[PDB]
Structure formats: structure tokens, C-alpha cells
């Protein structure tokens, strides 16, 4: 009961930012936080709902040649810059994105996620 994701339409491809590693009961799940100018930033508040696209799952191979699931979640480019300079803002958006994907596709993702520091994106582009 904190903040929430708001799904907007988007194609796609946008541009990668960073990659989050988590899992379901079945296997590994990767959340690719991407960004695009064509996606609205959060509305200026008078007194947080984050607009973001929730991409369809696409299977990719992990480092061991095993299939895993990856989701592309795109956010506003300017809002993304603000995310890069804010650990609080970034981690919140992660949680928000994860719960957005859980809602849309009926998944149970691991809250205890891990940040990929070398890999910016799981898949192609």
C-alpha cells in the first residue's frame, strides 16, 4: 500500500537502462528497466503513480544456455535520469515494476531481487 504502476501503451524497442534479476516458482525472471521519450513522465502532484509499459514475456538463454523469462518495462527517459541519481527512487520503481508484472501476468516474483551491474539488458535488440 505504497505507490503503484500505471500501464501505458508502447512499442518498442525503446532503449535499455538496467537489468534486474529475480525469480518465480518456475525459474529465473529478468526485468529490463528501459526508457523512452515517447512515454509520459509521472504527472506533477498538487499535494506516486508511475506510468510505464509492461512488455510481453520473451524467453532468453542464461549464461548456462538455459531458458529464462525476461520482461521489458519502459519508463520516461527524463524520469529515468532522476532514477539514476536516486537509490530510493530507483528501488521503488523496481518494486513498482515487479508488482506491475505480477498483476498483469499472474506471477509470483521474488521481492529479494538482485541488480545486474555488468549486464544492462537480458536479450536483444
Amino acid at each position: 500500500a505504497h505507490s503503484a504502476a500505471l500501464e501505458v501503451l508502447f512499442q518498442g524497442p525503446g532503449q535499455p537502462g538496467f537489468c534486474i534479476k529475480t525469480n518465480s516458482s518456475e525459474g529465473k525472471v529478468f526485468i529490463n528497466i528501459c526508457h523512452s521519450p515517447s512515454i509520459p513522465p509521472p504527472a506533477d502532484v498538487t499535494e506516486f503513480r508511475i506510468p510505464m509499459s509492461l512488455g510481453e514475456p520473451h524467453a532468453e538463454l542464461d549464461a548456462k544456455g538455459q531458458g529464462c523469462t525476461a520482461y521489458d518495462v519502459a519508463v520516461n527517459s527524463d524520469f529515468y535520469r532522476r532514477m539514476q541519481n536516486s537509490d530510493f527512487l530507483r528501488e521503488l520503481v523496481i518494486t513498482i515494476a515487479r508488482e506491475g508484472l505480477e498483476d498483469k501476468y499472474n506471477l509470483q516474483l521474488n521481492p529479494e531481487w538482485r541488480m545486474m551491474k555488468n549486464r544492462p539488458f537480458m536479450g536483444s535488440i
Binding site: 529465473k28 549464461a63 548456462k64 545486474m116 549486464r119 535488440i125
Partner: peptide, 11 residues
């Protein structure tokens, strides 16, 4: 210590 999948791949 790295994650098993934490390696740079030029998308």
C-alpha cells in the same frame, strides 16, 4: 562475488 548471469552483453 558476481551473479552467474551478471555479464556484459551488447544488446
Amino acid at each position: 562475488a558476481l551473479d552467474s548471469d551478471d555479464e556484459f552483453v551488447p544488446y
